[PDB]
Design an enzyme around this catalytic site. Structure first.
Site, PDB file in Angstrom:
ATOM      1  N   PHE A 149       0.827  -1.195   0.000  1.00 37.17           N
ATOM      2  CA  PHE A 149       0.000   0.000   0.000  1.00 37.17           C
ATOM      3  C   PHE A 149       0.879   1.270   0.000  1.00 37.17           C
ATOM      4  O   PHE A 149       2.100   1.241  -0.003  1.00 37.17           O
ATOM      5  CB  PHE A 149      -1.041  -0.105   1.128  1.00 37.17           C
ATOM      6  CG  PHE A 149      -0.453  -0.086   2.519  1.00 37.17           C
ATOM      7  CD1 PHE A 149      -0.278  -1.263   3.251  1.00 37.17           C
ATOM      8  CD2 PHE A 149      -0.096   1.115   3.119  1.00 37.17           C
ATOM      9  CE1 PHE A 149       0.250  -1.226   4.542  1.00 37.17           C
ATOM     10  CE2 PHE A 149       0.438   1.137   4.397  1.00 37.17           C
ATOM     11  CZ  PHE A 149       0.623  -0.026   5.102  1.00 37.17           C
ATOM     12  N   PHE A 155       2.345   4.291   1.805  1.00 35.87           N
ATOM     13  CA  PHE A 155       3.657   3.868   1.347  1.00 35.87           C
ATOM     14  C   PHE A 155       4.287   2.930   2.394  1.00 35.87           C
ATOM     15  O   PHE A 155       5.169   3.334   3.166  1.00 35.87           O
ATOM     16  CB  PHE A 155       4.496   5.094   0.950  1.00 35.87           C
ATOM     17  CG  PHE A 155       3.961   5.902  -0.208  1.00 35.87           C
ATOM     18  CD1 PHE A 155       4.197   5.509  -1.524  1.00 35.87           C
ATOM     19  CD2 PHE A 155       3.109   6.978   0.005  1.00 35.87           C
ATOM     20  CE1 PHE A 155       3.668   6.224  -2.596  1.00 35.87           C
ATOM     21  CE2 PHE A 155       2.534   7.662  -1.065  1.00 35.87           C
ATOM     22  CZ  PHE A 155       2.827   7.305  -2.372  1.00 35.87           C
TER      23      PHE A 155
HETATM   24 CU1  CUA Z   1       5.146   1.213  -3.634  1.00 34.45          CU
HETATM   25 CU2  CUA Z   1       7.017   2.272  -5.184  1.00 34.45          CU
END
Ligand code: CUA
Ligand code: HAS
Ligand code: HEM
Ligand SMILES: CCCCCCCC/C=C\CCCCCCCC(=O)OC[C@H](O)CO
Ligand SMILES: CCCCCCCC/C=C\CCCCCCCC(=O)OC[C@H](O)CO
Ligand SMILES: CCCCCCCC/C=C\CCCCCCCC(=O)OC[C@H](O)CO
Ligand SMILES: CCCCCCCC/C=C\CCCCCCCC(=O)OC[C@H](O)CO
Ligand SMILES: CCCCCCCC/C=C\CCCCCCCC(=O)OC[C@H](O)CO
Ligand SMILES: CCCCCCCC/C=C\CCCCCCCC(=O)OC[C@H](O)CO
Ligand SMILES: CCCCCCCC/C=C\CCCCCCCC(=O)OC[C@H](O)CO
Ligand SMILES: CCCCCCCC/C=C\CCCCCCCC(=O)OC[C@H](O)CO
Ligand SMILES: CCCCCCCC/C=C\CCCCCCCC(=O)OC[C@H](O)CO
Ligand SMILES: CCCCCCCC/C=C\CCCCCCCC(=O)OC[C@H](O)CO
Ligand SMILES: CCCCCCCC/C=C\CCCCCCCC(=O)OC[C@H](O)CO
Ligand SMILES: CCCCCCCC/C=C\CCCCCCCC(=O)OC[C@H](O)CO
Ligand SMILES: CCCCCCCC/C=C\CCCCCCCC(=O)OC[C@H](O)CO
Ligand SMILES: [Cu+2]
Lengths: 167, 554, 31
Positions: free
Chosen positions: A85, A87
């Protein structure tokens, strides 16, 4: 004559070269062949189309509770449901027994990410609404970094996870 | 000019060339900054004062890829592979269409350009859904590419008009090359076209809510492999049909040149899973099938290696060089139109070798999406293709314009290509190496400076390259503009013939040419391999559409 | 005989093999 001798001897040399060339490409294919026959094969994604709803992955099902996403699914076999996902990853960390068959099953609720486990051959694209499935056995204990190797937005360069491999 | 009245395609070709080289300059300004990044030095704060519309690392990277790999490569394919067949056949293109193709390309470039600059499609050159850019990008790109469809018709019309005037004659060598080159591209472009019209465009218009990302990559990499043979073949055309005479000799074999091109027609499109090795829900068997076919497409290149090397050895002996290596010295290392494509071919040695690694299925898990990949393709497209393109400035600029190239100009050009070549090899080392150390591509690594401490040596190389290539870029802009901003004109330059080479010919030549010349038969073959290669997978994936909502994450 | 082109194709072949075999090595090491 020069030019007519040139051409005949050029072409006679080019005929053998092309044949050596074929030979080599065939050996390459054979040596690829062998990899497909061995455990090194598990890193190849499953071909099965296995479709989910990226929109509910976080609310319903084996992705929803990261603290349970490790499941003994064989004698010496464990399944891990991974979320990639923006980050980061869940669970973080992924803790797993040394020496067991690990079957990763990674999905994404947003955009395409990479799942690349440093020091290993695990290097898989992760597309939303599809499950990536890859198997592997960690032979050494320690910490292994996950690095996101598909451009997924501005947070891309800090998207890291962790596998801990237990003795 | 009465020159352009007789020969109008000269002025249309030149329009193509300039827009391409403009694109290339702007494109490559982001380059040394991306190399500095790959060396752990953040120069972006700097570039943003200088260019304040740049908001992210990833905007620049998008402009770099689109502007260099898509615009410059296509506009060059367009200039070369229309003009040369026109001049081989001493025949005129349909001028109405020639202009129309140009206007299509210019209009599309400028529509695409606007969201790129305003930061509304920071999606990179592969534009993978569900990253959702501005509708104008999708519509831009679309008209730009389709401009080639007009190009294709122009050259087939030429061919046709020549064949009706010469029944029973074989297709001349250059027009042969261009014919199969344009018919191949027609097959190859249908993925992205299909991706554009059933998916990107409707979705960016908000007329449907989601796209299935697995179908998108699939159709995308339909076009995606063979767009690189589309970049390469014009350069190969020059290297086979023009470079011989510039070295001092002859092309050693027309048949062997033709067979090269025909195998590209056949094998360049049915190969895309090599881009999808790590993709889920595509069949392992179909991945292997694609990998084996990826190794075959390397054979024309292996073949081109022998034909060209034998050609240069020829010219060299005819120029006084003896022994195993003396032939190399005898060649004309004073002439930029010679040195450039040749140093290009040199770097293509390691670059083709990386190409075959990547091809080999399981081996791909080592390198996929690491620095290794940009390291691989800079040798291929940023040096061979570009070096050849710059090279042709040295005979093509005075043959379209009438402006002479001075001795000085010539000496600067030599410096330029040298430094470009050397900068590219240097960066290859860095990026190949960083990649084996797991350093990813498409990453602003300079912003996470303790993340890759084991790659500090390979990083030294990328700082160096970024500097070497900055200077090369600067001496190129100045160079090219001194020609294009020159008052002096010799109309007898615009009136000479293109430096095509003579061919050595042999008894086998005839029976062989005639085979390869059954063009319709060979095209139907290549269309067949496309349906077979992609067909069973698309029906799978279409049968099972899972479209997902788009995201904007920048 | 095109001794010259043959020396070039020799160079070609060697690079190919070092790349390909050198990466095969890494594969099984990481495996
Ligand atoms: Cu997740 Cu680049
Ligand atoms: C023009 C542009 C390009 C060419 C040409 C090219 C060639 C190949 N490549 Fe590549 N590449 C791949 C495999 C190959 C193979 C099998 C070949 C072959 O066509 C190459 C065969 C080449 C040869 C067999 C070399 C011939 C050598 C010659 C011709 C030199 C003779 C020298 C002379 C004569 C000089 C000596 C003489 C003197 C006188 C000194 C794969 C694998 O399947 C990927 C996926 C990677 C991944 O994991 O994502 C990939 C990735 C890319 C991408 C990135 C896509 C992305 O953005 O993610 C681009 C742009 C690209 C460009 C190019 N590539 N490549
Ligand atoms: C001064 C010359 C150039 C330099 C210094 C340079 C440098 C770089 C670097 C370091 C990257 C990697 C960025 C990343 O992966 O994050 C890159 C990406 C790229 N470059 Fe270049 N480049 C130059 C010229 C060219 C040319 C001439 C081409 C094509 C002809 C080109 C095409 C590309 C492409 C296609 C990418 C990858 C796009 C993507 O990942 O989305 N570059 N460049
Ligand atoms: C380490 C790996 C090994 C190194 C690879 C060597 C290069 C490969 C092939 C040589 C090219 C083929 C040469 C042989 C064919 C010549 C031939 O048949 O010559 C007959 C002719 O009539 C009389 O000149
Ligand atoms: C004139 C000569 C003609 C005939 C000769 C042709 C050459 C044969 C090529 C390759 C052999 C394939 C080797 C297959 C064995 C692979 C085993 C291996 O490398 O194992 C390492 C790994 O660690 C284990 O998991
Ligand atoms: C914007 C759309 C207008 C499209 C442009 C209309 C002008 C086309 C005129 C034309 O043929 O221009 C070609 C060339 O500039 C001759 O020197
Ligand atoms: C030269 C390129 C220009 C292309 C335009 C095609 C645009 C696509 C428009 C076609 C209509 C799409 C449509 O019918 O979408 C409704 C859909 O059924 C909802 O469920
Ligand atoms: C040349 C003509 C182009 C069509 C002009 C139509 C302009 C498109 C605006 C409508 C639109 O796409 O709005 C965004 C959408 O609602 C969310 O994706
Ligand atoms: C040109 C024609 C090409 C003909 C040569 C290809 C050989 C045939 C099948 C390989 C299939 C390999 C399938 C291995 C997948 C099994 C696996 O390990 O799945 C996990
Ligand atoms: C990383 C560094 C890689 C750089 C290696 C280049 C080797 C290419 C050698 C080819 C150039 C030879 C020059 C030559 O022949 O010069 C003749 C002279 O101009 C008249 O006497
Ligand atoms: C050594 C360690 C440091 C790395 C090198 C640093 C980079 C570039 C130096 C400049 C090199 C410029 C060479 C130009 C050669 C040239 O143009 O020669 C023309 C000649 O007439 C035949 O081609
Ligand atoms: C120059 C090439 C340097 C390549 C250094 C990379 C190290 C490597 O590939 O190590 C193999 C494996 O990962 C170890 O466990
Ligand atoms: C001559 C050109 C480059 C020097 C070669 C590059 C290698 C120099 C390494 C210096 C360096 O920075 O090494 C990293 C490390 O942090 C220090 O111990
Ligand atoms: C001259 C060669 C150019 C190299 C200049 C930068 C060197 C470099 O990379 O320095 C990093 C260093 O390790 C950080 O203290
Ligand atoms: C759009 C222009 C037409 C593109 C399609 C070209 C294919 C075609 O006409 O194929 C027939 C072939 O020429 C028979 O030998
Ligand atoms: C000049 C332009 C080109 C520059 C590109 C640099 C990359 C070169 C070769 C690839 C070889 C791979 C490196 C790894 C080889 C290591 C080896 O031989 O064994 C290691 C061991 O088996 C596993 O850990
Ligand atoms: Cu490809």
């Amino acid at each position: 004559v020069d030019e007519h001798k040139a051409h005949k001897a050029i072409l006679a040399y080019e005929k053998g070269w092309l044949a050596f060339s074929l030979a080599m490409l065939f050996v390459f294919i054979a040596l690829i062949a062998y990899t497909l026959a061995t455990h090194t094969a598990g890193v190849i994604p499953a071909g099965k189309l296995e479709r989910v709803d990226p929109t509910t992955v976080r609310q319903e099902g084996p992705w929803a509770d990261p603290a349970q996403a490790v499941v003994q699914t064989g004698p010496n076999q464990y399944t891990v449901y991974v979320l990639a996902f923006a980050f980061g990853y869940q669970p973080n960390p992924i803790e797993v027994p040394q020496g067991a068959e690990i079957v990763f099953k990674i999905t994404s609720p947003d955009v395409i990410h990479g799942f690349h486990v440093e020091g290993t051959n695990i290097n898989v694209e992760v597309l939303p609404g599809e499950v990536s499935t890859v198997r592997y056995t960690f032979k050494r204990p320690g910490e292994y970094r996950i690095i996101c190797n598909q451009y997924c937005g501005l947070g891309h360069q800090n998207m890291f996870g962790t596998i801990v491999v237990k003795e | 000019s009465r020159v352009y009245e007789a020969y109008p395609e000269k002025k249309a070709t030149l329009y193509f060339l300039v827009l391409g080289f403009l694109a290339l300059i702007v494109g490559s300004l982001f380059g040394p900054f991306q190399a500095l990044n790959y060396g752990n030095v953040d120069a972006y704060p700097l570039l943003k004062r200088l260019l304040p519309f740049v908001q992210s690392y990833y905007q620049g990277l998008t402009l770099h890829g689109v502007l260099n790999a898509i615009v410059f490569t296509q506009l060059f394919a367009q200039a070369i592979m229309v003009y040369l067949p026109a001049r081989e056949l001493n025949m005129r293109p349909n001028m109405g269409l020639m202009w129309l193709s140009w206007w299509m390309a210019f209009i599309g470039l400028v529509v695409a350009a606007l969201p790129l600059l305003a930061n509304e499609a920071t999606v990179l050159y592969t534009f993978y859904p569900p990253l959702k850019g501005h509708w104008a990008f999708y519509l831009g790109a679309s008209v730009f590419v389709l401009s080639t469809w007009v190009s294709i018709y122009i050259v087939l019309d030429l061919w046709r008009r020549w064949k009706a005037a010469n029944p029973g004659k074989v297709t001349p060598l250059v027009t042969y090359m261009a014919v199969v080159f344009w018919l191949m591209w027609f097959l190859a472009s249908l993925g992205l076209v299909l991706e554009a019209v059933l998916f990107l465009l409707p979705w960016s218009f908000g007329l449907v809510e989601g796209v299935d990302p697995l179908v998108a990559r699939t159709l995308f990499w339909w076009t995606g492999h063979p767009i690189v043979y589309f970049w390469l073949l014009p350069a190969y055309a020059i290297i086979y049909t023009i470079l011989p005479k510039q070295a001092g000799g002859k092309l050693v074999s027309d048949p062997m040149a033709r067979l090269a091109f025909l195998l590209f027609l056949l094998l360049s499109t049915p190969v895309g899973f090599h881009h999808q090795f790590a993709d889920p829900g595509i069949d392992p068997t179909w991945k292997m099938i694609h990998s084996v076919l990826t190794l075959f497409v390397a054979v024309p290149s292996l073949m081109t290696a022998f034909t060209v090397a034998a050609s240069l050895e020829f010219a060299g002996r005819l120029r006084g060089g003896r022994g195993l290596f003396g032939w190399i010295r005898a060649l004309p290392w004073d002439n930029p139109a010679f040195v450039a494509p040749v140093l290009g071919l040199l770097g293509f040695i390691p670059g083709g070798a990386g190409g075959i690694v990547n091809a080999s299925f399981t081996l791909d898990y080592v390198v996929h999406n690491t620095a290794w990949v940009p390291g691989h393709f800079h040798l291929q497209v940023a040096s061979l293709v570009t070096l050849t393109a710059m090279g042709s400035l040295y005979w093509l600029l005075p043959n379209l314009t009438g402006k002479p190239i001075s001795d000085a100009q010539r000496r600067l050009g030599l410096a330029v290509v040298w430094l470009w070549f050397l900068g590219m090899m240097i960066m290859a080392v860095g990026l190949h190496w960083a990649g084996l150390l797991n350093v990813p591509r498409r990453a602003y690594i300079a912003q996470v400076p303790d993340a890759y401490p084991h790659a500090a040596v390979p990083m030294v190389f990328n700082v160096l390259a970024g500097i070497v290539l900055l200077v090369a870029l600067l001496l190129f802009i100045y160079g090219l503009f001194s020609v294009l901003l020159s008052r002096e004109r010799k109309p007898e330059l615009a009136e000479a013939p293109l430096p095509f080479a003579e061919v050595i010919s042999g008894p086998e030549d005839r029976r062989l040419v005639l085979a390869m010349d059954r063009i319709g038969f060979w095209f139907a073959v290549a269309a067949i391999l496309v349906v077979l290669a992609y067909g069973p997978t698309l029906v799978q994936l279409f049968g099972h559409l899972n479209p997902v909502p788009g995201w904007r994450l920048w | 005989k095109p001794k010259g082109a043959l020396a070039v194709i020799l160079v070609l072949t060697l690079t190919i093999l070092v790349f390909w075999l050198g990466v095969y090595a890494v594969f099984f090491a990481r495996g």
